[PDB]
Amino acid sequence: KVFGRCELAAAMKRHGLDNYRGYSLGNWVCAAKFESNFNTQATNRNTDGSTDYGILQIDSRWWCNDGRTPGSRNLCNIPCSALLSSDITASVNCAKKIVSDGNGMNAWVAWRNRCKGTDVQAWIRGCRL
Ligand SMILES: CC(=O)N[C@@H]1[C@@H](O)[C@H](O[C@@H]2O[C@H](CO)[C@@H](O[C@@H]3O[C@H](CO)[C@@H](O)[C@H](O)[C@H]3NC(C)=O)[C@H](O)[C@H]2NC(C)=O)[C@@H](CO)O[C@H]1O
Known part of the structure; x- marks a missing residue:
């Protein structure tokens, strides 16, 4: 699914991301526009072999299992396809562990380059929130 902008805002707040670890809802909405263009089914292959999955582009080198990123970790303990659903629970769940892992939203390259400091x-x- 391709979310509408306020639709996604509403569902992210529902799932506890507004001000999660200090980051306002605007940050997360901005992160998704630049990572996936609000497309839950978005995928992107990286040079190292890993793939970035979903609306927040979670990478299989670190966070999910895709069965073809050999010698990688699965820190969110899900299969990567889990992140491609119309329901964003899994992605938001895993997103909370990513942003708590030490570097904040700097883990999201498009956020660091296009949302940070704007x-x-x-x-x-x-958005009616
Ligand atoms: C959304 C997404 O998938 N982003 C990916 C980034 O996660 C990733 O950056 C690297 O992330 C790993 C995992 O968090 C970083 O390791 C952590 O580094 C911190 C210190 O910065 C350390 O305290 C943590 O212990 C360590 N995590 C673990 C589990 O040990 C790593 O440092 C990040 N590396 C860089 C160069 O930014 C990048 C690169 O894999 O990919 C994104 O897609």
Whole structure:
């Protein structure tokens, strides 16, 4: 599924991401627009072999198992396809462990380069929240 902007905002707040580890909802909404364009089914292959899965592009080198990233970890304890669902629970669940792992949202390259230090509040503009 491709989320609407306020639709995704609503469902992320529902799932506890607004101000999770200090980061406002705007940050997360901005992270998703640049990582996946709000597409839950988004996939991207990396040079090292790993693949980035879903609306928040979680990488199989570190967080999920895709059965073809040999010698990698599965720290969220899920199969990577779990992250491609229309329901974002799994991705948001795993996202909370990523952002707590020491580097904050810097783990998300598009956030560091396109959302960080910008008016991220503007991504939740007009949303009935
Ligand atoms: C959303 C996503 O999948 N992002 C990926 C990033 O997770 C990843 O950056 C690397 O992440 C790992 C795992 O968190 C980092 O290891 C951690 O590093 C911190 C210190 O920075 C350390 O305290 C933690 O103990 C350690 N984690 C574990 C489990 O030991 C690693 O440092 C990050 N490396 C870099 C260069 O940023 C990148 C790169 O794999 O990929 C994104 O897709």
